[PDB]
Amino acid sequence: ELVLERCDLELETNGRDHHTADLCREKLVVRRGQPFWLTLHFEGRNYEASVDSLTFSVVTGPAPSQEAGTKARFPLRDAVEEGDWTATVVDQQDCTLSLQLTTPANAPIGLYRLSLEASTGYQGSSFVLGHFILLFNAWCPADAVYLDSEEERQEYVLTQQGFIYQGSAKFIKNIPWNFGQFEDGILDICLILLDVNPKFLKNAGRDCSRRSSPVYVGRVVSGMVNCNDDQGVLLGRWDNNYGDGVSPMSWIGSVDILRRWKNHGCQRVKYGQCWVFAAVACTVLRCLGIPTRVVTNYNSAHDQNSNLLIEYFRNEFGEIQGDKSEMIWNFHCWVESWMTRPDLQPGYEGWQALDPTPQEKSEGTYCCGPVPVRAIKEGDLSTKYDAPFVFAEVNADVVDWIQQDDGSVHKSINRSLIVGLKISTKSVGRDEREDITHTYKYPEGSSEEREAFTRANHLNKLAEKEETGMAMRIRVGQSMNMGSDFDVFAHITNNTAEEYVCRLLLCARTVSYNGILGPECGTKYLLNLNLEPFSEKSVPLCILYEKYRDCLTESNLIKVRALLVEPVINSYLLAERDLYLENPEIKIRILGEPKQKRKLVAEVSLQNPLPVALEGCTFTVEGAGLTEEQKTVEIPDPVEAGEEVKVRMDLLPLHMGLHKLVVNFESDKLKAVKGFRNVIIGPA
Ligand SMILES: Nc1nc2c(ncn2[C@@H]2O[C@H](COP(=O)(O)OP(=O)(O)O)[C@@H](O)[C@H]2O)c(=O)[nH]1
């Protein structure tokens, strides 16, 4: 019979065509909705359509079934593609045949395996061509994750090194991150992740069938990052007691987290955080083919049970009583994927927000799920998934009540805190920051904003607030350099033409990005502050390194809160600010000419800003397109104040194009300090 000796998958051509060149190392990895090539090597009889009939059968999942789309059998139609799964002969030479297979744009995602059934006469021999991986295609016009443009496809599906935005609203810091979705073994890790969710354990066949929908895959991926408690990827922790594992700030790449999760069976990786969850989810989604970007919202009202009215009761000193209340997060990071939604009303296609951080649900504290960004913009809270929570995270209202010792309460005019004021992501192509707050909220004070609030029953906050002549804000003169003492001003501007005798309550506390305040690092209690008519007074507060050294969080955030209170019945004024203390810059240099499969040396240096010595200095670099594993060096000698630490590392780049070298510094006193540098690998 027509027996075959070997089947030659064209790894190079398929990888180049389907943009899966990095993934096509040893196994074929193609994208649905596109024709991929294949080669058959028959020894002597070659192939004749007259008597030889080939019918491919492709199998997926532990419970295949034709009606569910997992299993598909299709003949060798030489003329055209008459259906979803088709195979046509494109070239026929001596001893060899070529094939151009095609997959439906709505095929399930996962590990498929082929089977040739060569039926010549009565001899229907059954073969096994091999396995391959099917991923979401952003290039197929009929696919649900199709992107019209090309730069967006490169940035969101093929770029494996990006920026996570942190710090404060007034000072955005672009911390580098190495997604590495195309790293060695990452795709298998993502498949195992998709093969261990509770839905798969409940009904494997239904899960495999429903993997075709990108929204379901997004839900499964986001829910298995942290939300799953049994064998989730990470284990959240917020108190600064990460000694049992790796601190959240220490992570520089999701590849390490995924490899640690896979190696230790499936146990939770130690002490991740919200932006870590977003980075891991973005890595998994990008590996699976879904165009995903990490989006950070500053002053987010996360974990408020979707409440649109947040009331904070404070004391006469401005300190928030009632510890049961949840603080306003300085920033919250969630992913945003590109999908088309048939399950919703027409027009709700495009960017969909996934939040892998479990909020406080009324049932079980689950994740959020894909809500259209346009749905949040128009306030369509009635969508399928958790629209109200994401809407509250960007459109909440905060009321700061002051409860004095007399038992009475007053409303403080807090004009500084705006929920969801700055939403940022990485720009397409360049390294700049793209401020996408306009796609989540309508412009303030506009008719569209009013109608969106009316559709969301949220028009309560639109009402005008107090308009007293007193005005006040927290001002910063120079850059916030960590490890040095500084002064932060409280600016009072008066235009009422009325002399005021008020008392001011400066207080600075080390705070994490969750809003968990720590011990005070400086205070100032002015009791007879005088404000002249049409005057403008700046009251400085001195913050000392010896004060915030002990309790500073690893995110280098300090909250300065000041309260201007008049003894008379008139209301109270409040002003808060978040200061990001800048870590010292990591100077990265590359010596030699960057060439593929050639030795490279990276000269990394840092200058210690602290007045004391760092003991356990440790550099760690990672790059998806530069190295196959993290390069870690430990300096065995402490570096004194002002002294400069300097190390050299060896790299063996293996991929072309542009790459980012993510560098992390970890010492006993200077915490995780990040750095990056773009390198272009030469053709050689
Ligand atoms: N590192 C750091 N720099 C800051 C921060 N806030 C402000 N700055 C610096 O202050 C400058 C802007 O000053 P600005 O805040 O507008 O002054 P203000 O309007 O009087 O409060 C920028 O160049 C920043 O470098 C912060 O939290 N961290």
XYZ file of C-alpha atoms and ligand atoms in Angstrom:
712
model
C 0.000 0.000 0.000
C 0.892 3.701 -0.062
C 3.118 3.714 3.012
C 4.997 6.841 4.126
C 8.429 6.910 5.762
C 8.553 10.431 7.226
C 6.463 13.601 7.318
C 8.410 16.851 6.951
C 6.761 19.761 8.722
C 8.148 22.958 7.183
C 9.095 24.622 10.457
C 10.955 27.540 8.866
C 8.324 28.490 6.278
C 5.416 28.071 8.699
C 7.206 30.071 11.388
C 7.987 32.885 8.963
C 4.445 32.997 7.563
C 2.536 32.678 10.852
C 4.940 34.910 12.841
C 5.668 31.993 15.196
C 9.330 31.677 14.220
C 10.498 31.831 17.841
C 8.008 29.167 18.960
C 8.722 26.798 16.037
C 11.883 25.324 17.572
C 11.047 21.601 17.611
C 7.247 21.418 17.273
C 5.046 23.087 14.675
C 3.193 26.147 15.996
C 0.689 27.775 13.637
C -2.244 30.163 13.927
C -5.857 29.383 13.072
C -7.382 30.784 9.903
C -4.193 30.592 7.829
C -2.881 27.945 5.403
C 0.295 26.267 6.650
C 2.599 24.179 4.482
C 3.499 20.515 4.888
C 5.577 17.915 3.040
C 5.141 14.161 2.560
C 7.923 11.807 1.436
C 6.578 8.687 -0.265
C 9.276 6.232 -1.288
C 8.389 4.783 -4.691
C 4.742 5.066 -5.690
C 4.637 8.800 -4.870
C 0.928 9.715 -5.275
C -1.751 9.479 -7.980
C -5.161 11.094 -7.443
C -6.707 8.402 -9.653
C -6.351 5.604 -7.090
C -4.871 7.218 -3.945
C -7.265 9.082 -1.642
C -6.008 10.975 1.412
C -8.361 12.070 4.214
C -6.721 13.902 7.109
C -8.158 13.541 10.606
C -7.114 16.052 13.263
C -7.758 15.356 16.939
C -7.701 17.641 19.989
C -8.470 17.229 23.672
C -9.101 14.151 25.809
C -12.758 13.942 24.672
C -12.851 14.759 20.948
C -16.149 15.138 19.122
C -16.963 16.467 15.660
C -19.920 18.609 16.747
C -17.774 20.421 19.329
C -15.086 21.328 16.779
C -12.256 19.469 18.522
C -12.039 16.638 15.962
C -12.180 17.360 12.234
C -11.897 14.958 9.294
C -11.393 16.400 5.817
C -10.395 14.875 2.461
C -7.696 15.947 -0.011
C -9.625 18.288 -2.298
C -7.126 19.370 -4.954
C -9.221 22.168 -6.479
C -10.339 24.594 -3.759
C -11.235 24.815 -0.050
C -14.865 23.680 0.263
C -15.252 24.095 3.999
C -13.467 25.054 7.193
C -10.828 22.313 7.497
C -9.326 21.740 4.046
C -6.172 20.250 2.539
C -5.058 20.826 -1.051
C -2.104 19.594 -3.098
C 0.044 22.472 -4.340
C 3.165 20.689 -5.650
C 3.848 17.102 -6.726
C 7.427 16.051 -7.479
C 9.274 12.751 -7.682
C 9.324 11.029 -4.263
C 7.720 14.069 -2.588
C 4.412 15.892 -2.255
C 3.510 19.297 -0.822
C 0.346 20.296 1.030
C -1.257 23.579 2.095
C -3.624 22.957 5.000
C -6.225 25.483 6.145
C -7.908 25.923 9.523
C -11.170 27.676 10.438
C -10.960 31.090 12.066
C -13.027 29.735 14.993
C -11.059 26.555 15.666
C -10.319 25.511 19.262
C -6.921 26.502 20.648
C -4.498 23.865 21.873
C -2.385 20.876 20.891
C -3.770 19.230 17.758
C -2.486 15.983 16.297
C -2.840 14.783 12.714
C -3.604 11.326 11.360
C -3.247 10.345 7.716
C -5.683 7.726 6.421
C -4.364 6.702 3.007
C -7.265 4.747 1.502
C -6.095 3.120 -1.734
C -8.553 0.529 -2.983
C -9.626 -1.494 0.044
C -6.401 -0.624 1.922
C -7.217 2.209 4.323
C -3.927 2.495 6.198
C -3.864 4.870 9.181
C -0.795 7.034 9.856
C 0.340 9.561 12.471
C 1.878 12.693 10.957
C 2.575 14.402 14.274
C 1.418 17.035 16.727
C 1.273 20.809 16.447
C -0.015 23.844 18.335
C -2.840 26.115 17.166
C -2.913 29.705 18.417
C -5.127 32.746 18.007
C -4.309 34.658 14.823
C -4.203 38.450 14.849
C -3.467 38.485 11.098
C -6.471 36.500 9.841
C -9.246 38.949 8.841
C -11.906 36.397 9.850
C -10.461 35.727 13.316
C -12.023 37.200 16.443
C -8.679 38.660 17.565
C -7.901 40.297 14.205
C -6.064 43.631 14.275
C -6.462 45.926 11.277
C -3.037 47.534 11.654
C 0.436 45.979 11.600
C 2.362 47.976 14.217
C -0.267 47.097 16.828
C 0.104 43.407 15.965
C 3.876 43.598 16.448
C 3.587 45.543 19.704
C 0.824 43.489 21.327
C 1.430 39.943 20.051
C 5.107 39.720 19.106
C 6.889 42.157 21.437
C 7.936 40.197 24.533
C 9.436 43.085 26.550
C 7.322 45.948 27.841
C 6.722 48.529 30.560
C 4.631 48.344 33.726
C 3.781 51.815 34.987
C 4.102 52.488 38.715
C 4.888 55.300 41.125
C 2.306 58.035 41.653
C -0.087 60.007 39.476
C 2.199 63.051 39.596
C 5.307 60.963 38.770
C 4.948 57.967 36.445
C 7.754 55.384 36.448
C 8.082 52.927 33.550
C 9.432 49.808 35.269
C 10.748 47.377 32.625
C 9.334 43.875 32.365
C 10.346 40.852 30.285
C 7.181 39.033 29.230
C 9.099 36.428 27.233
C 6.014 34.724 25.813
C 8.257 33.064 23.198
C 10.837 31.756 25.679
C 11.734 28.072 25.832
C 8.952 25.998 27.378
C 6.596 28.937 27.946
C 3.991 27.674 25.464
C 3.848 24.260 27.139
C 3.486 25.996 30.509
C 0.567 28.037 29.161
C -1.051 24.877 27.785
C -0.691 23.162 31.170
C -2.219 26.283 32.731
C -5.197 25.990 30.377
C -5.389 22.256 31.178
C -5.699 22.578 34.982
C -8.459 25.155 35.488
C -11.528 23.967 37.443
C -13.673 24.157 34.303
C -11.379 21.670 32.551
C -11.437 19.369 35.583
C -15.246 19.539 35.582
C -15.873 18.981 31.849
C -12.720 18.536 29.768
C -14.544 18.174 26.453
C -16.682 21.268 26.984
C -13.603 23.254 28.026
C -11.726 22.171 24.897
C -14.731 23.041 22.724
C -15.153 26.463 24.358
C -11.446 27.295 24.040
C -12.290 28.531 20.523
C -13.840 31.699 21.980
C -11.102 34.198 22.942
C -13.203 35.620 25.793
C -13.425 32.216 27.485
C -9.667 31.723 27.109
C -9.113 35.164 28.615
C -11.340 34.316 31.574
C -9.550 30.999 32.113
C -6.113 32.627 31.919
C -6.954 35.547 34.213
C -8.668 33.292 36.751
C -5.691 30.934 37.040
C -3.095 33.635 37.752
C -4.026 34.440 41.355
C -7.769 33.877 41.750
C -7.385 30.094 41.844
C -6.258 29.182 45.364
C -5.608 25.450 44.903
C -2.957 25.476 42.141
C -3.002 29.086 41.009
C 0.126 30.595 39.514
C 0.914 33.084 42.287
C 0.105 33.698 45.952
C -0.692 37.302 46.791
C 0.858 39.010 49.793
C 0.788 42.659 50.816
C 2.471 43.021 54.216
C 6.226 43.530 53.954
C 7.117 40.014 55.142
C 8.247 38.370 51.893
C 11.183 36.593 53.564
C 9.620 33.185 52.895
C 10.024 33.624 49.122
C 10.708 36.290 46.514
C 9.477 39.831 47.063
C 6.965 41.085 44.461
C 9.208 43.988 43.420
C 12.101 41.587 42.794
C 10.355 40.032 39.781
C 11.608 41.260 36.406
C 10.047 38.656 34.110
C 6.988 36.413 33.992
C 9.156 33.652 32.492
C 10.808 33.042 35.864
C 7.440 32.973 37.645
C 5.951 30.512 35.159
C 9.026 28.264 35.254
C 9.009 28.272 39.064
C 5.308 27.383 39.047
C 5.826 24.521 36.591
C 8.975 23.096 38.203
C 7.496 22.854 41.716
C 4.625 20.748 40.433
C 1.892 23.367 40.231
C 2.256 25.088 43.619
C 1.675 28.824 43.910
C 4.706 31.014 43.285
C 5.668 32.936 46.409
C 4.388 36.468 46.974
C 3.267 38.065 43.755
C 1.183 41.230 43.583
C -1.390 42.932 41.369
C 0.919 44.206 38.635
C 2.733 40.860 38.793
C -0.626 39.205 38.110
C -1.196 41.571 35.189
C 2.262 40.860 33.768
C 1.796 37.087 34.005
C -1.680 37.262 32.457
C -0.382 39.449 29.624
C 2.469 37.003 29.018
C 0.089 34.040 28.831
C -2.376 35.863 26.568
C 0.395 37.059 24.237
C 1.774 33.518 24.067
C -1.700 32.226 23.192
C -1.976 34.880 20.457
C -4.466 37.291 22.059
C -3.206 40.885 21.631
C -2.845 42.080 25.227
C -1.342 45.147 26.908
C -0.843 45.958 30.590
C -2.789 49.061 31.649
C -2.198 50.892 34.934
C -4.833 53.097 36.575
C -3.643 55.541 39.220
C -5.735 56.382 42.290
C -7.811 53.271 41.610
C -10.718 52.442 43.929
C -10.017 48.710 43.884
C -11.566 46.199 46.303
C -14.487 48.470 47.228
C -17.257 45.951 46.393
C -18.100 48.053 43.308
C -19.247 50.907 45.555
C -19.536 54.224 43.719
C -19.585 56.277 46.953
C -16.607 55.899 49.302
C -16.895 57.598 52.695
C -13.793 58.063 54.856
C -14.147 59.164 58.484
C -11.048 60.932 59.806
C -10.060 62.492 63.120
C -9.204 66.100 63.929
C -5.605 65.299 62.920
C -6.628 63.944 59.506
C -5.779 60.316 60.297
C -8.396 57.954 58.876
C -10.155 56.053 61.651
C -12.115 52.873 61.012
C -9.448 50.411 59.886
C -12.171 48.172 58.417
C -12.407 50.614 55.497
C -10.450 49.824 52.339
C -7.981 52.500 51.274
C -7.700 54.008 47.800
C -4.993 52.167 45.879
C -2.241 54.392 44.511
C -2.235 52.345 41.303
C -3.782 49.120 40.021
C -2.637 47.218 36.932
C -4.907 45.045 34.791
C -4.593 43.640 31.293
C -6.473 44.737 28.176
C -6.933 42.294 25.296
C -8.254 42.805 21.768
C -11.312 40.686 20.997
C -14.566 40.788 19.054
C -17.608 39.864 21.134
C -20.520 38.086 19.403
C -22.213 37.406 22.755
C -22.874 41.118 23.350
C -24.780 43.714 21.366
C -23.161 44.839 18.094
C -20.562 47.568 18.478
C -19.010 46.262 21.716
C -15.831 44.994 20.071
C -12.238 46.025 20.623
C -10.428 46.386 23.935
C -11.629 44.202 26.818
C -10.372 44.693 30.372
C -9.282 41.634 32.369
C -8.501 42.018 36.079
C -6.606 38.972 37.414
C -6.582 40.440 40.936
C -9.544 38.991 42.894
C -11.822 41.729 44.206
C -14.417 41.360 46.984
C -17.265 39.716 45.114
C -20.567 39.150 46.880
C -20.294 35.394 46.192
C -16.699 34.169 46.273
C -14.239 37.033 45.647
C -13.660 36.133 42.001
C -11.990 38.042 39.156
C -13.618 40.648 36.914
C -13.643 39.200 33.401
C -13.724 40.826 29.967
C -15.811 43.998 30.005
C -15.602 46.233 26.911
C -13.677 49.437 27.502
C -16.360 51.206 25.469
C -18.961 49.715 27.821
C -17.200 51.356 30.769
C -16.853 54.587 28.779
C -20.597 54.722 28.047
C -21.484 53.307 31.473
C -23.249 50.198 30.141
C -23.122 48.349 33.452
C -25.604 45.729 32.188
C -23.006 43.927 30.058
C -22.317 40.221 30.486
C -19.311 40.399 32.806
C -18.310 42.504 35.801
C -18.847 45.980 34.367
C -19.779 47.655 37.705
C -16.463 46.839 39.399
C -14.267 48.173 36.589
C -16.590 51.175 36.279
C -16.235 51.911 39.999
C -12.451 51.533 39.802
C -12.368 54.490 37.381
C -15.442 56.540 38.369
C -15.769 56.204 42.139
C -16.500 59.182 44.382
C -14.547 59.734 47.605
C -16.010 61.780 50.467
C -13.709 62.613 53.383
C -15.705 63.159 56.582
C -13.910 64.673 59.579
C -15.318 63.487 62.920
C -14.014 65.718 65.705
C -13.933 65.006 69.434
C -17.278 66.777 69.962
C -19.096 63.917 68.213
C -20.113 66.097 65.260
C -18.979 65.524 61.679
C -17.987 67.859 58.861
C -17.359 67.542 55.131
C -13.770 68.307 54.136
C -13.130 69.890 50.735
C -10.676 67.365 49.277
C -9.897 68.824 45.846
C -6.742 66.740 45.307
C -8.005 63.138 45.131
C -9.464 62.149 41.751
C -10.268 58.481 41.177
C -8.828 57.143 37.932
C -7.172 60.428 36.992
C -4.244 58.954 35.016
C -4.498 55.726 33.003
C -1.342 54.793 31.117
C 0.128 52.040 28.962
C 3.082 51.429 26.674
C 3.046 53.210 23.328
C 3.045 51.198 20.110
C 6.592 50.843 18.813
C 8.237 53.574 20.866
C 9.044 53.540 24.582
C 6.895 56.574 25.405
C 3.816 56.512 27.629
C 0.365 56.391 26.019
C -2.220 58.042 28.276
C -5.465 56.209 27.518
C -7.647 57.749 30.213
C -9.769 59.195 27.392
C -10.945 55.747 26.272
C -12.153 54.816 29.780
C -13.909 58.053 30.786
C -15.576 60.892 28.937
C -14.142 64.400 29.411
C -15.095 65.913 32.750
C -18.053 68.277 32.767
C -19.311 67.155 29.353
C -22.780 66.170 28.184
C -21.520 62.717 27.191
C -20.157 62.219 30.708
C -23.515 63.263 32.170
C -25.474 60.853 29.974
C -23.023 58.021 30.698
C -23.438 58.649 34.430
C -27.221 58.726 33.986
C -27.107 55.367 32.204
C -25.030 54.041 35.130
C -27.114 55.679 37.903
C -23.936 57.489 38.961
C -24.922 61.142 38.376
C -24.773 61.779 42.144
C -21.096 62.785 42.118
C -21.594 65.233 39.230
C -23.236 67.722 41.612
C -21.179 70.814 42.386
C -19.163 70.732 45.611
C -18.100 73.510 47.988
C -16.445 76.568 46.430
C -14.753 78.344 49.325
C -11.926 80.797 48.749
C -9.388 78.575 50.497
C -7.195 76.513 48.177
C -4.321 74.239 49.051
C -2.035 71.655 47.484
C 1.100 69.630 48.177
C 4.083 70.911 46.187
C 7.444 69.288 45.436
C 10.421 71.369 44.349
C 13.109 69.011 43.039
C 13.278 65.346 42.089
C 12.476 62.821 44.820
C 15.858 61.140 45.218
C 15.715 58.160 47.570
C 18.162 57.964 50.457
C 18.434 61.732 50.978
C 16.621 64.149 53.261
C 14.251 66.576 51.566
C 11.554 69.215 52.013
C 7.971 69.016 50.724
C 5.882 72.183 50.709
C 2.231 72.774 51.539
C 0.999 75.619 49.336
C -1.874 77.788 50.600
C -3.352 80.337 48.200
C -5.881 82.877 49.468
C -8.077 85.132 47.342
C -11.058 85.838 49.639
C -9.535 89.177 50.756
C -10.095 88.011 54.342
C -7.346 87.367 56.881
C -7.549 83.785 58.146
C -6.285 82.268 61.400
C -6.042 78.544 60.655
C -4.020 75.608 61.964
C -2.222 73.190 59.655
C -1.522 69.489 60.108
C 1.346 68.293 57.886
C 2.076 64.581 58.263
C 4.080 62.231 56.035
C 3.786 58.447 56.299
C 5.455 55.601 54.441
C 2.672 53.939 52.453
C 2.509 50.988 50.092
C 0.648 51.193 46.797
C -2.325 49.494 48.495
C -2.794 52.587 50.656
C -1.647 50.746 53.801
C -0.086 53.622 55.737
C 2.876 53.029 58.016
C 4.560 54.927 60.845
C 4.940 58.673 60.443
C 8.205 59.886 58.906
C 7.713 63.579 59.699
C 5.046 65.907 61.065
C 4.291 69.594 61.554
C 1.467 70.947 63.723
C 1.088 74.681 63.145
C -1.451 76.174 65.549
C -1.505 79.895 64.659
C -1.033 79.970 60.893
C -1.920 83.403 59.502
C -3.114 83.893 55.917
C -3.124 87.495 54.726
C -5.701 88.718 52.197
C -4.623 87.923 48.628
C -1.584 86.097 50.022
C 0.210 82.863 49.138
C 2.173 80.944 51.779
C 4.307 77.806 51.481
C 4.877 75.812 54.679
C 7.758 73.314 54.345
C 7.896 69.863 55.910
C 11.284 68.222 56.445
C 11.382 64.478 55.755
C 14.553 62.746 56.927
C 16.091 59.509 55.682
C 16.550 58.296 59.262
C 12.760 58.456 59.711
C 11.472 56.523 56.683
C 14.417 54.114 56.386
C 12.873 51.467 58.642
C 9.296 51.294 57.347
C 9.598 52.368 53.700
C 7.840 49.994 51.339
C 9.664 48.430 48.409
C 7.696 50.665 46.005
C 9.294 53.849 47.427
C 5.956 55.575 48.054
C 5.324 58.195 50.750
C 1.950 59.838 51.402
C 2.042 63.473 52.533
C -1.302 64.562 53.999
C -1.973 68.097 55.208
C -5.120 69.485 56.819
C -5.976 73.182 57.120
C -8.623 73.592 59.824
C -10.153 76.862 61.030
C -11.314 76.974 64.673
C -14.563 78.686 63.612
C -17.535 76.687 62.308
C -16.276 76.990 58.709
C -15.362 73.782 56.913
C -12.028 71.979 56.722
C -9.529 71.800 53.857
C -7.488 68.719 52.960
C -4.662 67.973 50.541
C -2.770 64.727 49.960
C 0.003 63.667 47.613
C 1.984 60.523 46.829
C 5.744 60.923 46.384
C 7.814 58.300 44.565
C 11.398 58.227 45.825
C 13.626 57.717 42.792
C 15.997 54.766 42.902
C 19.556 55.337 41.654
C 20.000 54.816 37.932
C 21.527 51.539 36.744
C 24.104 52.321 34.053
C 24.052 49.556 31.431
C 26.715 49.370 28.721
C 27.283 46.807 25.961
C 30.856 46.114 24.866
C 31.429 44.552 21.458
C 29.296 44.413 18.343
C 25.832 42.861 18.844
C 25.707 39.825 16.550
C 23.507 36.742 16.469
C 25.083 33.636 18.031
C 28.069 35.732 19.113
C 29.575 36.530 22.494
C 28.450 39.768 24.135
C 29.472 41.435 27.396
C 27.259 43.700 29.496
C 28.918 46.206 31.840
C 26.446 47.033 34.603
C 27.202 49.712 37.183
C 25.457 51.509 40.026
C 26.320 54.254 42.509
C 25.189 53.767 46.095
C 23.188 56.834 47.215
C 22.643 55.703 50.794
C 24.933 57.139 53.502
C 25.545 53.559 54.707
C 27.003 50.413 53.137
C 25.071 47.801 51.165
C 25.930 44.244 52.195
C 24.188 41.726 49.942
C 24.513 43.317 46.511
C 23.158 41.108 43.727
C 22.653 41.907 40.050
C 20.188 39.934 37.934
C 19.634 40.416 34.206
C 17.101 38.799 31.898
C 16.178 39.119 28.234
C 13.840 37.132 25.997
C 15.952 37.706 22.883
C 19.374 37.900 24.560
C 19.722 35.014 27.030
C 18.102 31.648 27.702
C 18.060 32.134 31.491
C 18.578 34.803 34.124
C 22.189 35.852 34.701
C 22.766 36.505 38.409
C 25.994 37.765 39.983
C 26.594 38.300 43.703
C 29.180 40.842 44.854
C 31.071 39.284 47.804
C 32.235 42.637 49.232
C 30.045 45.385 50.736
C 30.133 48.771 49.008
C 30.388 51.863 51.194
C 28.607 55.191 50.788
C 29.379 56.886 47.485
C 31.257 53.820 46.242
C 30.248 52.396 42.867
C 29.431 48.733 42.270
C 30.430 47.379 38.860
C 29.925 43.941 37.290
C 30.283 42.290 33.886
C 28.053 39.578 32.430
C 28.284 37.280 29.412
C 25.400 37.008 26.941
C 24.765 34.821 23.888
C 22.017 36.459 21.807
C 20.164 34.060 19.530
C 17.399 36.140 17.901
C 17.419 39.114 15.546
C 15.680 42.464 15.953
C 15.416 44.707 18.984
C 15.512 43.514 22.591
C 15.551 44.988 26.092
C 18.038 43.903 28.762
C 16.121 43.957 32.045
C 18.472 44.578 34.983
C 17.589 44.313 38.678
C 19.657 45.246 41.734
C 18.873 43.574 45.064
C 20.765 44.385 48.267
C 20.063 44.260 51.998
C 19.219 47.974 52.274
C 18.717 49.128 48.664
C 15.732 47.145 47.412
C 14.912 46.067 43.850
C 16.245 48.737 41.482
C 15.214 48.365 37.844
C 16.905 49.261 34.576
C 16.714 48.585 30.841
C 18.608 49.139 27.600
C 17.631 48.568 23.971
C 19.981 46.481 21.816
C 19.627 45.634 18.118
C 21.082 42.251 17.172
C 23.129 42.308 13.980
C 22.512 40.016 11.009
C 25.637 37.917 11.634
N 11.009 61.424 41.711
C 9.888 62.172 41.852
N 9.858 63.402 41.280
C 8.766 64.190 41.389
C 7.609 63.693 42.142
N 6.675 64.658 42.097
C 7.190 65.685 41.375
N 8.437 65.406 40.956
C 9.296 66.299 40.144
O 8.751 67.618 40.150
C 8.680 68.153 38.830
C 7.277 68.696 38.614
O 6.950 69.559 39.697
P 5.419 69.772 40.133
O 4.900 68.561 40.870
O 4.557 70.077 38.933
O 5.499 71.038 41.118
P 4.177 71.568 41.861
O 3.096 71.834 40.842
O 4.504 72.842 42.598
O 3.702 70.520 42.837
C 8.979 67.026 37.858
O 10.088 67.380 37.028
C 9.333 65.822 38.704
O 10.647 65.364 38.377
C 7.720 62.345 42.739
O 6.777 61.853 43.393
N 8.858 61.667 42.554
